[PDB]
Design a protein around this ligand. Structure first.
Ligand SMILES: [Mg+2]
Ligand SMILES: [Mg+2]
Ligand SMILES: [Mg+2]
Ligand SMILES: [Mg+2]
Ligand SMILES: [Mg+2]
Ligand SMILES: [Mg+2]
Ligand SMILES: [Mg+2]
Ligand SMILES: [Mg+2]
Ligand SMILES: [Mg+2]
Ligand SMILES: [Mg+2]
Ligand SMILES: [Mg+2]
Ligand SMILES: [Mg+2]
Ligand SMILES: [Mg+2]
Ligand SMILES: [Zn+2]
Lengths: 45, 107, 86, 122, 23, 116, 97, 96, 136
RNA sequence: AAAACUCCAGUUGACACAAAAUAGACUACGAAAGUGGCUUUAACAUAUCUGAACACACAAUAGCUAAGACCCAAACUGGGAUUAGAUACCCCACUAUGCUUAGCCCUAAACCUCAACAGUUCAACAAAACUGCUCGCCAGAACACUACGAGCCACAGCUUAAAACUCAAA
């Protein structure tokens, strides 16, 4: 299962041919890691 | 010294190897791995080379082989980091333990 | 020195009451333990004396909160005497 | 193993930023890494004035390079990041999604210690 | 315990080192 | 929550260094320590200062700043009355919690048991 | 004849389960000032403050409802070998009947 | 004999209490949560008696805070004023 | 309604003091040593406006490290701030001397209005090693 | 208080080869010494146990040899106080030294003064009393962490370690 999961995960790896398009995709994308916890064990994003 | 293109011990029994692409082969090869996995490969290679059953890991011979690959690792660490007194002690103690196990296996 | 200058350890007055503004600030420093850090770093405390002092403070903390727990546990039996004449 | 590169870059425009990410990823691949993802945490004010390469930086662009590198490329990669003058701060760590989370049953309660002292009268 | 034996050895040691310094 | 005392003392069967080295045996006593006294206050400083800045400004004339001379005087009067009130207050009752003597009575009623 | 274990299983105090948050009825049997000494069954009595609302129908023999936080109220302290017993349970008075 | 008690593991056993982050993944990039566990005025990391975390989680909060402060994600001497708005989870009381 | 936390520089803030925002109020720095108390009033752009200390006000050796001396020094620094045209003050204290409150109250009675208190006392994260412990 | 500094002090901006607030009310790792800023690499002996004071490998701090670093602290030394005197306590300044590298030296109240492994539930103080097995050590005080001999990169050293006189105790 790990080999098959890794196999499908390589298709979106960055190569020399995907480099410019992926850098521009990274530049117009944005990911947020910040999230808060409450007094109860609940996540506020 | 196994070559860097050698496969991991946990991964060298899955049927799909020769058909996966070169980046996956590299990614699960030993170049994309560490010295603990290299020592595991070396130890099982020695086990296949010498002992009768390489699936025991509870015998005097298997314990001597494990101590020998650990002694080689302790050595190599010492000629990089010469001033490592804790690992010098570990190497000397492991040498004495291997000598004790050698004496027991000889007798 | 390299941080923004007017956020850390900053409190504000209400209605001009600089007294409670400072008393709040000194409370901030005391509850964060900064006051005792400055008072202990005025002179160098050698590491043996450091370890002795922190072991002593930890033992005192253990004893003090165990006694406080006992006092709160017996303040309910500090009622008036139920049977006066025995 | 899998590594994560936290990259604080100088506050730039789109072409200079794209060129700098290109040089960093190309250096990774030349030292022998297969790069997995690039993430853009975005341009924001720094927590403090980071002084790097004879310039005092107040804002920076946060990027992440998730990749896999051999065990003997991290030192060369940090040397290259030390020499790059477009990088405010580059750092390589092992991947928190390669360290695995353990199941926790909860907080096991602790009782009061007993028989620390003898039962003599004292 | 007290330190009288430690004090006796202390004075013995001190006089010994002063003797070695002098001679 | 009290800090644990599991392996903090040098004991037989403890495979660690002693974390704590208490000079007295860690057993709750039957007593509460006496209430500490307040320290020196040095009151009336500001009013003394303003009266006496007058004195150096106006060549020491009571007729020149009667007003905060009276300020210094009533500061002295209120400080003495505050002394009397706080003495009677601490003799009467501790703020929030109780007197050490009555707490000693409660702990004599419920003694500690270090033995069998 | 029935056994002591029979008495135990067909006793309500064993049918209780844990003592916490169980509503019980009880009788007032001793009163000093405003400290009402209520029994609820079980080994000990609880003591409650007199509720200032409806504060005159709390008399000797009155039936009251209790939340019954605890049954015994003991704890062990730093040097003790046994617990320090209050000889008293813990309950919160809710009202009448 | 049908009425003598029988041996079993404790019924009415409440499940063990769980810390606030217990089961959650803490990162050095999660400077909203690490800012929750940092003091607003002085930047001090709060203790176990204030945070109320299990030992593992408190250790990871401390390590992640120190990492983020040295990598340039967190101020050292203060909490983020952008994050003096989030749900407070620490048992401390400064004002009065 | 009130916040004891300061206004962040780069956002909207309805709080004002004689038209000025929080960021352009002049700053009075009080270094309160164990033997002296020094008060310096500067602008937001670090233009020196007023400077007074206990030794400046006339206390010579050991009377400097008292409350009354810092009170006098704060009064003098406040008077110089008034003649420089200063009304509102942000106070920043550095040290743990006797005359910390006394310097602040000297400013207040001199006639300045404190809007915010800051404590920039130098606390190393185990940097330089201090003097040896005195055997008094 | 004097001495000292005024090439001084306060705000701001640049800026380390030094030391690692809070977490730390946690009790971890290591054989011991020791180890609490961040990252990465290498990595934490033994699938019975005890066991080398005829060996090997380590071992805080101080110290020695050679070459560097320098904020701060600081033996020594100098100055000021104090004192009958003050070779000290108190204040100021500065050096060896603390740091790095390479090599020595091999000592501590190196003590948790409580040996390793396996197992059980009363002299007095201290940290309750024991069992099996093995190793090491001890046998009145002082002479004595001494003398002589031997070994050692140690040469004012360390390890091992007496006796003659003395006492009726320690
Ligand atoms: Mg003692
Ligand atoms: Mg002079
Ligand atoms: Mg260092
Ligand atoms: Mg052995
Ligand atoms: Mg030995
Ligand atoms: Mg040594
Ligand atoms: Mg110096
Ligand atoms: Mg020097
Ligand atoms: Mg030691
Ligand atoms: Mg010994
Ligand atoms: Mg042994
Ligand atoms: Mg010696
Ligand atoms: Mg000798
Ligand atoms: Zn948890």
């Amino acid at each position: 299962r790990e080999v098959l999961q890794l196999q499908e995960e390589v298709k979106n790896f960055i190569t020399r041919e995907n480099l410019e398009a992926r850098v521009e995709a990274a530049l117009d994308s944005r990911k947020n890691y910040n999230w808060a916890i409450t007094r109860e064990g609940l996540v506020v994003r | 010294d196994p070559p860097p293109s050698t496969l991991l011990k946990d991964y060298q029994n899955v049927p799909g190897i020769e058909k996966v692409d070169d980046v996956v082969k590299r990614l699960l090869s030993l170049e994309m791995a560490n010295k603990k996995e290299m020592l595991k490969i070396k130890q099982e290679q020695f086990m296949k080379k010498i002992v009768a059953n390489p699936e025991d890991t509870r015998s005097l011979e298997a314990r001597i082989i494990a101590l020998s690959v650990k002694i080689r690792s302790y050595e190599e660490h010492l000629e990089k980091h010469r001033k490592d007194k804790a690992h010098k002690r570990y190497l000397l103690m492991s040498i004495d333990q291997r000598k004790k196990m050698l004496k027991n296996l000889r007798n | 020195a390299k941080h923004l200058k007017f956020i850390a350890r900053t409190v504000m007055v209400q209605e001009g009451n600089v007294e409670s503004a400072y008393r709040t600030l000194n409370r901030i420093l005391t509850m964060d333990g900064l006051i005792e850090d400055i008072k202990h770093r005025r002179y160098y405390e050698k590491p043996c004396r450091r370890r002795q002092r922190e072991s002593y403070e930890r033992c005192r903390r253990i004893y003090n909160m165990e006694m406080a727990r006992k006092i709160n546990f017996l303040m309910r039996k500090n009622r008036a005497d139920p049977w006066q004449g025995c | 193993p899998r590594y994560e590169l936290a990259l604080i870059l100088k506050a730039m425009q789109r072409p200079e930023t794209a060129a700098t990410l290109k040089r960093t990823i190309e250096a990774l691949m030349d030292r022998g890494a297969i790069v997995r993802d690039l993430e853009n945490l975005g341009e924001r004010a720094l927590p403090y004035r980071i002084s790097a390469h004879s310039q005092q930086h107040n804002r920076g662009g946060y990027f992440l390079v998730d990749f896999y590198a051999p065990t003997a490329a991290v030192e060369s990669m940090v040397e290259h990041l030390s020499r790059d003058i477009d990088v405010i701060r580059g750092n390589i760590v092992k991947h928190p999604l390669t360290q695995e989370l353990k199941e926790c049953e909860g907080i096991v309660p602790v009782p009061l210690a007993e028989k620390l002292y003898s039962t003599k009268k004292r | 315990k007290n330190v009288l034996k430690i004090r006796r050895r202390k004075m013995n040691h001190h006089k010994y080192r002063k003797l070695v310094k002098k001679t | 929550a009290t800090p644990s005392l599991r392996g903090r003392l040098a004991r037989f069967g403890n495979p660690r260094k002693p974390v704590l080295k208490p000079n007295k045996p860690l057993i709750l006593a039957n007593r509460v320590g006496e209430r500490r006294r307040e320290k020196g206050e040095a009151t009336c400083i500001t009013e003394m200062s303003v009266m006496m800045a007058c004195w150096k400004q106006n060549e020491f004339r009571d007729d020149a700043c009667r007003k905060e001379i009276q300020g210094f005087l009533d500061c002295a009067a209120r400080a003495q009355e505050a002394r009397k009130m706080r003495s009677i207050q601490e003799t009467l009752g501790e703020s929030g919690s109780l007197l050490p003597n009555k707490l000693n009575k409660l702990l004599q009623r419920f003694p500690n048991k270090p033995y069998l | 004849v029935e056994s002591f274990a029979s008495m135990l299983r067909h006793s309500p105090l064993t049918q209780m389960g844990p003592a916490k948050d169980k509503l019980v009825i009880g009788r007032i049997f001793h009163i000093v000032e405003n400290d009402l000494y209520i029994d609820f069954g079980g080994k000990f009595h609880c003591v409650c403050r007199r509720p200032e609302v409806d504060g005159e129908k709390y008399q000797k023999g009155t039936r009251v409802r209790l939340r019954l936080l605890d049954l015994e109220l003991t704890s062990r302290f730093l040097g003790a070998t046994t617990d320090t017993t209050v000889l008293e349970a813990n309950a919160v008075l809710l009202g009448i009947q | 004999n049908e009425d003598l008690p029988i041996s079993m593991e404790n019924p009415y056993k409440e499940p063990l209490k769980k810390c606030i982050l217990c089961g959650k993944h803490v990162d050095y990039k999660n400077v909203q949560l690490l800012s929750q566990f940092v003091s607003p005025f002085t930047g001090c990391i709060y203790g176990r008696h204030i945070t109320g975390l299990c030992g593992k989680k408190q250790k990871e909060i401390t390590k992640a805070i120190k990492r983020a402060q040295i990598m340039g994600f967190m101020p050292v001497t203060y909490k983020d004023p952008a994050y003096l708005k989030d749900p407070k989870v620490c048992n401390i009381r400064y004002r009065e | 309604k009130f916040s004891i936390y300061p206004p962040i520089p780069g956002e909207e803030s309805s709080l004002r003091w004689a038209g000025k925002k929080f960021e352009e109020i002049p700053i009075a720095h009080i270094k309160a040593s164990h033997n002296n108390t020094q008060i310096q009033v500067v602008s937001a752009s670090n233009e020196p406006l007023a400077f007074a200390s206990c030794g400046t006000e006339g206390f010579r050796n050991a009377k400097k490290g008292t409350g009354i001396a810092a009170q006098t020094a704060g009064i003098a620094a406040a008077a110089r701030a008034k003649q420089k045209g200063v009304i509102h003050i942000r106070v920043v204290v550095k040290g743990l001397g006797p005359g910390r409150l006394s310097a602040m109250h000297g400013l207040i009675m001199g006639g300045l209005e404190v809007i915010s208190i800051t404590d920039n006392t130098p606390i190393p994260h185990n940097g330089c090693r201090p003097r040896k412990a005195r055997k008094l």
